[PDB]
Amino acid sequence: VVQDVKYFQRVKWQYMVLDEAQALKSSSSVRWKILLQFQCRNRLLLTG
DNA sequence: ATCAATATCCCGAGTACATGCACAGGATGTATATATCTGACACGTGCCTGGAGACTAGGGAGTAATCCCCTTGGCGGTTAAAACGCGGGGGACAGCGCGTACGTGCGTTTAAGCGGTGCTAGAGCTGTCTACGACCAATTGAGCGGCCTCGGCACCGG
């Protein structure tokens, strides 16, 4: 997703769920910023 | 936006070696005639180059974002240029002789002709079988992440 973020940017997304988000704990990482940059009205998580 | 100091061009005169023409001649260009095979002309032939159809898809044409190489401008250091004096070797004339071109004589050596015959060439279908297509598992390398240790600033102590 981070590498190919440009491909996802041109496509609109009705819903987004990012399972196993326990990795998304460091805001200094590129993953955090890239995930934040997506334009989606609703965000859902299933991280345990 | 000019005046001195050089350098160059123009013209005239004394001078000379090289151009241009005539002469004697000799050997190569020319006219005549013969032999003859190389190439013009005709014929058939069948290889293959040109035309069109349909389908696949690799490749080209069009667009957009952008980071990079291109170009302009500015400055410091120095490598070459311009002109002076100093110094040596290029440049201009006679004497030898050993090379190069003719002349003469000889024989070795290729061209030519005619049988003889292995021998390279072409299409034969021959069969293998390397090498071009497709797929797949090896290492190499960079972009990332987690954690630990070190160092600076704000807070409390004497």
Curated annotation (Swiss-Prot):
According to PubMed:10574462, widely expressed. According to PubMed:16298340, specifically expressed in brain, liver and pancreas. It comes from the Eukaryota. It is found in: Cytoplasm; Nucleus; Cytoplasm, Cytoskeleton, Spindle; Chromosome. Component of the chromatin remodeling INO80 complex; three different complex modules assemble on different domains of INO80. Interacts with DDB1. Interacts with transcriptional repressor protein YY1; the interaction recruits the INO80 complex to YY1 target genes. Interacts with YY1AP1. Interacts with tubulin alpha. (Microbial infection) Interacts with Epstein Barr virus (EBV) lytic switch protein BZLF1; this interaction participates to the activation of early lytic viral genes by BZLF1. ATPase component of the chromatin remodeling INO80 complex which is involved in transcriptional regulation, DNA replication and DNA repair. Binds DNA. As part of the INO80 complex, remodels chromatin by shifting nucleosomes. Regulates transcription upon recruitment by YY1 to YY1-activated genes, where it acts as an essential coactivator. Involved in UV-damage excision DNA repair. The contribution to DNA double-strand break repair appears to be largely indirect through transcriptional regulation. Involved in DNA replication. Although the ATP-dependent helicase activity displayed by the INO80 complex requires INO80 ATPase activity, it is likely that the helicase function is carried out by the other components of the complex, RUVBL1 and RUVBL2, and not by INO80 itself. The DBINO region is involved in binding to DNA. Belongs to the SNF2/RAD54 helicase family. This is Chromatin-remodeling ATPase INO80. It comes from Homo sapiens (Human).
